[PDB]
Design an enzyme around this catalytic site. Structure first.
Site, short mmCIF file in Angstrom:
data_model
loop_
_atom_site.label_atom_id
_atom_site.label_comp_id
_atom_site.label_asym_id
_atom_site.label_seq_id
_atom_site.Cartn_x
_atom_site.Cartn_y
_atom_site.Cartn_z
N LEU J 36 0.83 -1.19 0.00
CA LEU J 36 0.00 0.00 0.00
C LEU J 36 0.87 1.25 0.00
CD1 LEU J 36 -2.87 -1.00 2.42
CD2 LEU J 36 -2.95 -0.69 -0.06
N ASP J 37 0.46 2.23 -0.79
CA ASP J 37 1.19 3.48 -0.87
C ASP J 37 1.03 4.26 0.42
OD1 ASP J 37 1.71 2.75 -3.48
OD2 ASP J 37 0.00 3.87 -4.27
#
Ligand code: 3PE
Ligand code: SF4
Ligand code: SF4
Ligand code: SF4
Lengths: 70, 41, 140, 180, 116, 387, 130, 340, 59, 77
Positions: J36-37
């Site tokens: 996940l960013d």
């Protein structure tokens, strides 16, 4: 900056140089007549400032990017 | 005072209003008022 | 009846509004004709756009224009209000209110005379005298 | 160090007592200062009005007042404008668009002559600079077109407008040209 | 001597601190999205707002200088300032949203042949 | 804790002659926080005269502050002719001074009239406009229109006056003092304007200097300083001119100081009717402003000067300047950086209607909304002098 | 006393005058009528400033621009003298017709506009050889 | 049965045609007071402007999605029905001896002038706008606070009357010209009378564009002419009500008509004339009153709500309670009380 | 330099100051005559009421 | 606590870019486990606070890296 005396009836000018990249600090810490004018300076130029409350736009449209007096 | 404007008392003047001559605007100086102030400044 | 009372709402943006309030001055009075403007876009008939018209203003102007009853007209008072006028080459000006609202009578020139605004008003009323709405229900 | 800025003399001005002796309560109590203003506006009510019945009467039109750009010609006029472009280069909203050509008879004339009456500020610089005095601000306020297409004055409108009146323009110049 | 939604202007030095500051800005700018859809009455949904906000920050993922990222942070927080209340109007507000296709008709398919 | 709401004050017609979009927040109908919002009218003159010449610049330039037109013409012209090292002859200085003071009569008259209309009385508004129409004619017999004018130039003015104007303006000033008293009798004395205006919007001098205020509000805060008696441009030196000084920094002294400036400006119109010399009313040479239109058709050199003065503008020496005069709304400053070429490399205006508007939030706190309507009109907020 | 100072008109023109102007000015020296309209200056001793000179328009469909514009100064006080006095000022006209269309706005025959010249570029004519 | 319906049509057309031309009248007199001329152009002379304006502004009729039509389509009709018209049920000296009213006069006028106030309040209740209804509550609050000192003073002037039917005040007042000559608090009644029917120098809730470019709601159309006509009709009713009790009807030339009608008519020729001069008396006492309303429209500016409540609950009301600490006292002192 | 609009060879100076209260009776007589008018008004008013004392018992 | 993370593993599953819900161990990372960013991390944090109708401070948004931390802050009401 053009400043005005009261006791002495004498103007003065004071210049800095600022880049679009780097800011220069405002002068709103000294008095309250600044925080409108520096909004005007930021809007007409994108001369970004520093140490200042409410650096909004006044002088353009609210979704308008760019800086006109460049 | 009185005798100013309308509802007139029949008294007015648009005559003998002159100063007829030839001009004598003797000047040349562009900016010499400031030189003492510039020397102060 | 529509031609007689004829009140606007002031939109009144600049110098041309100073001439508009000179039509409320006693020399070229509005009320000798019937022009008694309210400050409310529902109680209005015609919407005198005076002054120049910024890019920033124009959605507010059209929103004022929409909340206005159906027998509505627009006077473009002032050269800047129609075809952009004396600025017209700004980033922030609207090149004429024809880009915003439909207009029925133009009024030329930076500030047009109080004479000029009343002449435009009488020309608008002369247009009203050819509206022929009832016999257009009769489909002439 | 003299530095002569001083002397506001700062009036202390206690002003506690002796303004009035119950007259103060009279003027405060009933509106004598305010009834005075009512008597003033009633005295103003009787005097003259100032309305000018504008379809039938007109305000003062000075000879130097500005109007709708009528092109003059000479006596037996050969279209006095020479497209000299001086009236282009100062129209401060660039409402002037000219094009010129050597016409058939040798002289230079206007091929087209264009005034954006959308954007004519009426500064009169056109009149103040056209050297043969060929573009002239009129005094006539004869306007109120319903389209922009009825405002964009070409050459024919301006020559027609000068042909509609030069009488008024001759009155105007013959009271103004020794001042222009 | 006042604010409207506490706009502060003080650029920090370290790029990590600017990272965290833009991150919290992104949180508020994302949290205000149902307030935006309430305030302006758009046609599209709140996830359209969210994917376009994410698009706008991915437009400047790979900008190097912190001394450019400063005024980008100021622009972001400042347009958050002018969006969190009703300074912007919906005609002013749709300048972020190329929403509809049917305005254009048939158009350029990004081929050379149909430039002509 | 505080849970305050907000309103938008004026879209179109709250204060006349102003697009006063004021985002104003209230708790108890108290203006705890004030955020003026102007700039709706950013017509961008400040950009536009960077591509226009100096002769072209002036009919941009009185479109700012559209109630004091040729005074704004005069401050731009002083900024330019200061930057030309020339001096307009004495006829020009006297007619620009008397026109500055009928312009001052016009500006303070329209300000007090629009102020009192926002306060609520309609008769002072219309009575004042009745002789504003006479002043419109006194423009019109000089200018080309009613209120705007290209009449001042950097090189002096456009053209000398006509005779019947100077004869009539005395007969006007004969009655204007009487009618100024007539509008004065029903506002200055009444208990309304005495609680409608109280110590309201008190601005101390320590603060007023720190706010960038000027002009009528400054002299209402009791500092006997303007420009005209203190940095005398354009023959205010030569005329007996007395300047009113406030004692209390409220709006009531800001009323009474304007009402004193009327009957000080009328003395100026008196003595400028008397002392009017005979002389050249443009500048003396013809390198810089305009040739006379008589001998521009009998002479080579007059034609070349006419031609270049309306094509390329004219030469301006390089460098900076700034020049401020007291317009009747306050100190107007013009800051011009001239390239050394035909066109100004930078012009920045400076407007009291852009500074007083900036001070508005610091002044408006601790009031009610019908206080705020009056305190707009006191500090001369005609928003055509914003940008 | 404005009533009997309107009695000088004669009530046949007064009942039309009141139907035209709200005020009834005293019928005074006619100046000279023009191409469409009739004027009046006014020698009445007691009238306010610049409500001396006025017009009966001869048309129920009345407006401005029915005035032939040489008189337009004399209705706007551009000259003391009535324009039917001096012949040497008045005659530049040898642009021989003087048709004087008043104004045609809203009328089907309104003024419209057009480029005078031709297109700037002059496309080629399709001539083929063999 | 036929005579009274044509009576009531004559009286309704009198009041309606009256309040129609009243707005043209006030605009003319403002205009001469503002050194200009009023509506001088409309049709046939220049007496007709409102009579064309009524037909004009019918044909607009907007509605608002922020508000139920069912209240604002009726609330300006409410104050048109009750505040304007059925205040004339009392026939506020229908200027003869006779009226179209049975009896029990003054507190009926009190009740209906009281009934108009939430006609104003529910009008301002509309549209659910958080900046609007506070202005409504402002308007209604100052409205009731000056209703109270209409009420508490015209109940003390009838302490010289004690009879509550309409006429008995008027037959009582013909001896002294009782109305103002014995007491000048008429003027505070007058300054009360501009507030309880706000056509005022106060203009207070008419912050026309200080709010979001609208003052009351901008209910334009038929509700606009309803509100407009009812405000002007409330003005001429409360002005008549001033000329009813604390200014006098029945001018003293009818008291002297004993020395005139006995020198004019022989014996009761259909009562042909006296009702006409009595109507003339009451009409010239009424229009000369409202001429001062049209003064005070254009003499003194708006009046600053906090100072307005200062002007009610601090100054006028304690002076008032003093003034009926003495008018029960002074007649008790000097000689005695009134009968009924 | 030729005939331009020069000044007049006189001034006849004009008003530049304020104006005055109207009539001579500024003091409290403008109140005290008020006490005269009530001093007349009750002088008949109660008396009329006094006369109704005889009138009511008449009926 | 019980079945709060049922709702959380419903919201994050309804959120895109996580093609394997079997890869969603509950007590697991965000950016290590699922890539996940850091922008998308606080994106799903704002999604979580919007689902439960709850508002969080800034440091509480700072400390969240795994959902056991998230459930532990969910426990505060
Ligand atoms: C003694 C023998 C007889 C005994 C019987 C006595 C009967 C006497 C008759 C009644 C007495 C009259 C009393 C008048 C009450 C008015 C009082 C008043 O207005 O007070 C002024 C007050 C000022 O405000 P404030 O600042 O709070 O004052 C404190 C200052 N330190 O408040 C204000 O703000 C002023 C606002 C007033 C608004 C008025 C607007 C114009 C009204 C003028 C129209 C009336 C003229 C027409 C009628 C006249 C007919 C002749
Ligand atoms: S049209 Fe002319 S008068 Fe009006 S705003 Fe534009 S420049 Fe000013
Ligand atoms: S009058 Fe002024 S704006 Fe018009 S064309 Fe001439 S120079 Fe241009
Ligand atoms: S200034 Fe004269 S010559 Fe030049 S374009 Fe205009 S009319 Fe023609």
């Amino acid at each position: 900056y053009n400043f005005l005396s009261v006791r002495h009836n004498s103007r003065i000018r004071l210049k800095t140089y600022a880049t679009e990249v780097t800011p220069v600090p405002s002068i709103t810490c000294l008095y309250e007549g600044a925080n409108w004018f520096e909004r005007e300076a930021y809007d007409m130029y994108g001369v970004f400032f520093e140490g200042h409350p409410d650096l909004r736009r006044i002088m353009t449209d609210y979704g308008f990017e760019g800086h006109p007096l460049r | 005072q009185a005798a100013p404007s309308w509802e007139n008392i029949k008294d007015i003047r648009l005559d003998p209003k002159v100063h007829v001559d030839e001009v004598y605007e003797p000047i040349v100086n562009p900016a010499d008022r400031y030189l003492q102030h510039v020397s102060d400044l | 009846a529509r031609q007689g009372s004829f009140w606007p709402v002031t939109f009144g943006l600049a110098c041309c509004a100073v001439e508009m309030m000179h039509v409320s001055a006693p020399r070229y009075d509005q009320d000798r004709l019937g022009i008694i403007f309210r400050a409310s876009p529902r109680q209005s008939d015609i919407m005198i756009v005076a002054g120049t018209l910024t890019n920033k203003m124009a959605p507010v102007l059209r929103q004022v224009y929409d909340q206005m009853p159906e027998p509505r007209w627009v006077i473009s008072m002032g050269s800047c209000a129609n075809g952009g006028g004396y600025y017209h080459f700004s980033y922030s000006v609207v090149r004429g209110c024809d880009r915003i609202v439909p207009v029925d009578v133009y009024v030329p020139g930076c500030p047009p005379t109080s004479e000029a605004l009343m002449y435009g008003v009488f020309q608008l009323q002369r247009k009203m005298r050819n509206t022929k709405i009832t016999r257009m229900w009769y489909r002439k | 160090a003299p530095p002569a800025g001083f002397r506001i003399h700062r009036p202390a001005t206690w002003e506690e007592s002796e303004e009035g002796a119950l007259s103060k309560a009279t003027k405060y109590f009933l509106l004598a200062e305010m009834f005075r203003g009512l008597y003033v506006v009633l005295e103003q009510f009787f005097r003259a009005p100032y309305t000018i019945y504008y379809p039938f009467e007109k305000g003062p039109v000075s000879p130097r007042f500005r109007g709708e750009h009528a092109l003059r010609r000479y006596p037996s006029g050969e279209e006095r404008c020479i497209a000299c472009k001086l009236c282009e280069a100062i129209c401060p909203a660039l409402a002037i668009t000219i094009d010129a050509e050597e016409r058939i008879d040798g002289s230079r004339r206007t091929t087209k002559y264009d005034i954006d009456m959308t954007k004519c500020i009426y500064c009169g610089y056109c009149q103040e600079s056209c050297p043969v005095d060929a573009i002239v601000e009129t005094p006539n306020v004869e306007y109120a077109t319903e389209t922009r297409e009825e405002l964009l004055y070409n050459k024919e409108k301006l020559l027609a407008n000068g042909d509609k009146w030069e009488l008024e323009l001759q009155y105007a110049l013959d009271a103004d040209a020794p001042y222009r | 001597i006042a604010t409207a939604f506490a706009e502060t202007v003080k650029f920090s030095g370290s790029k990590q601190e600017l990272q965290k500051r833009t991150l919290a800005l992104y949180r508020q700018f994302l949290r205000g999205a149902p307030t935006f859809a309430d305030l302006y009455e758009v046609q599209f949904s709140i996830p359209t707002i969210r994917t376009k906000i994410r698009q706008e920050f991915e437009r400047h993922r790979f900008v190097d200088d912190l001394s450019i990222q400063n005024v980008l942070y100021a622009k972001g927080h400042m347009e958050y300032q002018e969006c969190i209340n009703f300074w912007k109007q919906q005609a002013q507000f749709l300048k972020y949203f190329p929403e509809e296709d049917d305005i254009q008709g048939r158009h350029q398919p990004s081929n050379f042949v149909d430039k002509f | 804790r505080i849970r305050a709401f907000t309103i938008n004050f004026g879209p179109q017609h709250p204060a006349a002659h102003g697009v006063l979009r004021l985002i104003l927040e209230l708790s108890g109908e108290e203006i705890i926080r004030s955020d003026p919002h102007v700039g709706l009218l950013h017509r961008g003159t400040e950009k536009l005269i960077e591509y226009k010449t100096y002769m072209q610049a002036l009919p941009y330039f009185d479109r700012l502050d559209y109630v004091s037109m040729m005074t704004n013409e005069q401050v731009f012209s002083l900024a330019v002719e200061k930057l030309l090292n020339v001096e307009v002859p004495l006829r020009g200085k006297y007619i620009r001074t008397m026109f500055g003071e009928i312009t001052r009569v016009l500006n303070h008259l329209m300000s007090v009239c629009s102020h009192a209309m926002d306060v609520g009385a309609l008769t002072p508004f219309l009575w004042g406009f009745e002789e504003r129409e006479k002043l419109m004619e006194f423009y019109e017999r000089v200018s080309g229109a009613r209120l705007h004018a290209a009449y001042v130039r950097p090189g002096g003015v456009s053209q000398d006056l006509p005779a019947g104007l100077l004869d009539d303006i005395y007969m006007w000033a004969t009655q204007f003092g009487d009618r100024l008293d007539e509008i004065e009798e029903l506002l200055t004395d009444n208990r309304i304007w005495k609680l409608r205006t109280v110590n309201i919007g008190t601005v101390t001098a320590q603060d007023a200097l720190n706010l960038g205020l000027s002009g009528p509000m400054l002299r209402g805060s009791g500092i006997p300083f303007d420009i005209r008696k203190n940095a005398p441009y354009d023959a205010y030196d030569k005329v007996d001119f007395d300047v009113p000084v406030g004692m209390n920094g409220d709006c009531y002294d800001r009323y009474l100081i304007r009402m004193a400036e009327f009957r000080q400006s009328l003395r100026i119109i008196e003595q400028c009717c008397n002392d009017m010399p005979a002389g050249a009313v443009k500048v003396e040479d013809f390198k810089i402003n305009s040739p006379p239109r008589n001998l521009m058709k009998e002479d080579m050199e007059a034609l070349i000067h006419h031609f270049l003065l309306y094509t390329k503008g004219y030469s301006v020496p390089p460098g900076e300047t700034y020049t401020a005069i007291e317009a009747p709304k306050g100190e107007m400053g013009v800051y011009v950086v001239s390239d050394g070429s035909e066109r100004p490399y930078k012009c920045k205006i400076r407007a009291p209607g852009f500074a007083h508007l900036g001070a508005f939030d610091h002044i408006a706190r601790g009031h009610f909304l019908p206080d705020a309507v009056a305190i707009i009109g006191t500090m001369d907020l005609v928003f055509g002098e914003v940008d | 006393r404005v009533l009997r100072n309107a009695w000088e008109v004669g009530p046949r023109s007064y009942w039309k005058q009141l139907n035209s102007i709200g005020d009834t000015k005293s019928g005074r020296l006619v100046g000279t009528d023009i191409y469409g309209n009739k004027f009046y200056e006014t020698d009445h001793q007691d009238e306010i400033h610049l409500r001396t000179r006025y017009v009966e328009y001869k048309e129920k469909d009345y407006d401005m621009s029915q005035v032939e514009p040489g008189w337009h100064f004399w209705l706007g006080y551009g000259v003391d003298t009535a324009p039917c006095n001096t012949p040497k000022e008045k005659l530049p006209i040898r642009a021989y017709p003087y048709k004087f269309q008043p104004n045609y706005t809203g009328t089907p025959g309104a003024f419209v506009t057009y480029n005078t010249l031709k297109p700037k570029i002059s496309a080629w004519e399709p001539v083929t050889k063999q | 049965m036929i005579i009274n319906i044509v009576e009531i049509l004559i009286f309704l057309v009198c009041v309606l045609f009256s309040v129609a031309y009243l707005t043209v009248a006030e605009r003319k007199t403002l205009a001469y007071m503002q050194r200009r001329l009023g509506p001088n152009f409309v049709g046939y002379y220049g007496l007709l402007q409102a009579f064309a304006d009524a037909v004009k502004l019918l044909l607009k009729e907007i509605v608002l999605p922020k508000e139920s039509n069912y209240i604002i389509l009726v609330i300006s009709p409410l104050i048109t029905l009750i505040t304007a018209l059925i205040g004339w049920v009392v026939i506020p000296l229908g200027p003869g001896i006779t009226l179209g009213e049975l009896n029990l006069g003054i507190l009926f006028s009190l009740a209906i002038g009281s009934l108009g106030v939430f006609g104003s309040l529910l009008s301002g209740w509309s549209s659910n706008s958080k900046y609007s209804l506070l202005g409504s509550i402002r308007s209604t609050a100052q409205l009731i606070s000056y209703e109270l000192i209409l009420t508490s003073i015209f109940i003390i002037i009838i302490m010289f009357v004690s009879s509550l039917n309409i006429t008995t005040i008027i037959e009582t007042q013909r001896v002294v010209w009782y109305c103002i000559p014995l007491l000048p608090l008429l003027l505070i009644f007058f300054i009360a009378s501009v507030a309880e029917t706000a056509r005022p120098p106060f203009d207070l809730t008419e912050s026309e564009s200080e709010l979001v470019a609208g003052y009351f709601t901008e209910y334009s159309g038929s509700p606009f002419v309803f509100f407009f006509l009812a405000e002007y009709s409330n003005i001429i009713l409360i002005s008549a009500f001033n000329g009813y009790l604390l200014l006098g009807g029945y001018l003293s030339f009818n008291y002297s008509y004993l020395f005139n009608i006995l020198f004019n008519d022989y014996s009761y020729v259909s009562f042909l004339f006296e009702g006409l001069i009595n109507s003339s008396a009451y009409a010239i006492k009424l229009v000369f009153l409202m001429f001062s309303f049209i003064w005070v429209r254009a003499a003194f500016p708006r009046f600053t709500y906090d100072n307005l409540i200062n002007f009610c609950w601090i100054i006028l009301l304690p002076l008032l309670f003093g003034i009926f600490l003495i008018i029960p006292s002074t007649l008790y002192i000097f000689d005695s009380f009134p009968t009924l | 330099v030729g005939q331009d609009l020069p000044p007049v060879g006189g001034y006849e100076p004009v008003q530049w100051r304020r104006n005055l209260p109207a009539r001579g009776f500024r003091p409290l007589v403008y109140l005290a005559a008020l006490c005269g008018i009530c001093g007349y008004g009750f002088y008949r008013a109660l008396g009329g009421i006094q006369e109704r004392r005889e009138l009511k018992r008449e009926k | 606590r019980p079945d709060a993370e049922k709702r959380i593993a419903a919201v994050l599953e309804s959120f895109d870019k996580i093609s394997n819900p079997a890869a969603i161990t509950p007590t697991a990372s965000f950016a290590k486990d699922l890539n996940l960013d850091s922008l998308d991390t606080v994106e799903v944090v704002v999604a979580i606070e919007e689902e439960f109708g709850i508002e969080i401070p800034d440091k509480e948004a700072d400390e969240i890296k795994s959902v056991n931390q998230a459930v532990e802050y969910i426990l505060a009401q």
